[PDB]
């Protein structure tokens, strides 16, 4: 009965720890995936605004080429 008593309390400890651990890792996983995502949507927004500038060079280059 003593060994059973220490197993039960070891199990409660082991379960509280595993819950804290998994919440800790679930969160760091979410915060990392969310940062990547937010950064990728911004980088794609800048990438195509910067294409607008390459096309604005191309258009000013034509007005001299044609004159």
């Amino acid at each position: 009965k003593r060994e059973h008593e220490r197993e039960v309390i070891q199990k409660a400890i082991e379960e509280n720890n595993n819950f804290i651990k998994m919440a800790k890792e679930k969160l760091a996983q979410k915060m990392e995936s969310n940062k990547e995502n937010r950064e990728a949507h911004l980088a794609a927004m800048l990438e195509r605004l910067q294409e607008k500038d390459k096309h604005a060079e191309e258009v000013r280059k034509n007005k001299e080429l044609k004159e």
Binding site: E5, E7, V8, I9, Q10, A12, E15
Partner: protein
């Protein structure tokens, strides 16, 4: 023949404190520990329950245990709260949340060793220690879970001393939480293995006695505990005063328990008195005998006519005719002899002690080992399986490391105990 008393959790310490009030008044000890009595029967067996201190003071051999400080500050403030040895208040701060697993495995385990330290210091001052009596309920977490943890550890340290308990059974009529049937079933599993004698004190019966017989429309724990302390005083009369018998806990177990697991006693008391209001006609010996066998005077809500008496102890208190007591006791047997098992000859034993309890001239305490007690365990078993078949409320217990399996084992042990009682009621 010293007895070591332990009281655990809210219920155990509330009925514990009343017990020491009642018997202290009987032995003529005051709330400061000084004896102010007239007779010497009061002091001949005072050491069964009291240690003697320098200054010729008397200090209960009582250890007060809780996982919460609440009730125990109440005891220490109560009338006789100062009589208790202060080193013997052993308490934590977290409480047990009416949760057997907290009392037995997590919170209680933190505190149990310091309780065993006090128990050890008490035992080592004993010429001839009989054993232990525990007051506790089975429905909360401390008295239930930690109380049965203590018993399991006391038996490991003192395997050859007697283990005696007063165990308050839960009832929906006086109910604190829905999980009482779980805590009580887990506790009965422990009691069946590790006690020699347990007085089953059914909050269901104390309620019905208060409501029907005492005409109290709204019973409180105060009304219930008045009944409990009168019973506790009655059943321990033979330990605390001298008789033709030199009575102790082991002789009681030897004569009351024909099979080791069947050690759950039905207590009864007569006359049934409400607190405060006294009545002025003493009962007659015929009346005591009839009431104390009346199901209405039983503290376990079980019908004795639905079972059979394996053994019976009867203790009459007051100035009365021993001839007439013998006559009335022989009359109740020979008139209803079918309710006594024929294969234990002469299974009824009666004692008389001169000193009555406070405020009565005549009283009778009944201790029955009846196969009808299975009704109590059936009741609790049905309430247990109603929830357990849906695993309801288990998370409170699995959160403390317990497995469903351990509930299945405890339920199944309690159902075996029921079947073992039915074996001998047909025998």
């Amino acid at each position: 023949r010293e007895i070591v008393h332990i009281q655990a959790g809210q219920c155990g310490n509330q009925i514990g404190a009343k017990f020491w009030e009642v018997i202290s008044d009987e032995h003529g000890i005051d709330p400061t520990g000084s004896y102010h009595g007239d007779s010497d029967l009061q002091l001949e067996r005072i050491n069964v329950y009291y240690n003697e201190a320098t200054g010729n003071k008397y200090v209960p051999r009582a250890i007060l245990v809780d996982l919460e400080p609440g009730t125990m500050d109440s005891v220490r403030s109560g009338p006789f709260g100062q009589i208790f040895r202060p080193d013997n208040f052993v308490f934590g701060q977290s409480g047990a949340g009416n949760n057997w697993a907290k009392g037995h495995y997590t919170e209680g385990a933190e505190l149990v060793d310091s309780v065993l330290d006090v128990v050890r210091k008490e035992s080592e001052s004993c010429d001839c220690l009989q054993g232990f009596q525990l007051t506790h309920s089975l429905g909360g977490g401390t008295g239930s879970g930690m109380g049965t943890l203590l018993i399991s550890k006391i038996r490991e340290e003192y395997p050859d001393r007697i283990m005696n308990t007063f165990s308050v059974m839960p009832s929906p009529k006086v109910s604190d939480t829905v999980v009482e049937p779980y805590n009580a079933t887990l506790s009965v599993h422990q009691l069946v293995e590790n006690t020699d004698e347990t007085y089953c004190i059914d909050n269901e019966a104390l309620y019905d006695i208060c409501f029907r017989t005492l005409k109290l429309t709204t019973p409180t724990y105060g009304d219930l505990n008045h009944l409990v302390s009168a019973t506790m005083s009655g059943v321990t009369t033979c330990l605390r005063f001298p008789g033709q018998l030199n009575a102790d806990l082991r002789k009681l177990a030897v004569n009351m328990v024909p099979f080791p697991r069947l050690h759950f006693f039905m207590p009864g008391f007569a006359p049934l008195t409400s607190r405060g209001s006294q009545q002025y006609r003493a009962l007659t010996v015929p009346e005591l005998t009839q009431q104390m066998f009346d199901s209405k005077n039983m503290m376990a809500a079980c019908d004795p006519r639905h079972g059979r008496y394996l053994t019976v102890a009867a203790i009459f208190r007051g100035r009365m005719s021993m001839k007439e007591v013998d006559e009335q006791m022989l009359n109740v047997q020979n008139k209803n002899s079918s309710y006594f098992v024929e294969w234990i000859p002469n299974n009824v034993k009666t004692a008389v002690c001169d000193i009555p309890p406070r405020g009565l001239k005549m009283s009778a305490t009944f201790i029955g080992n009846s196969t009808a007690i299975q009704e109590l365990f059936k009741r609790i078993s049905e309430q247990f399986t109603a929830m357990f078949r849906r695993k309801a409320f288990l998370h409170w217990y699995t959160g403390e490391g317990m497995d469903e399996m351990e509930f299945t084992e405890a339920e199944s042990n309690m159902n075996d105990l029921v079947s073992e009682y039915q074996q001998y009621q047909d025998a």
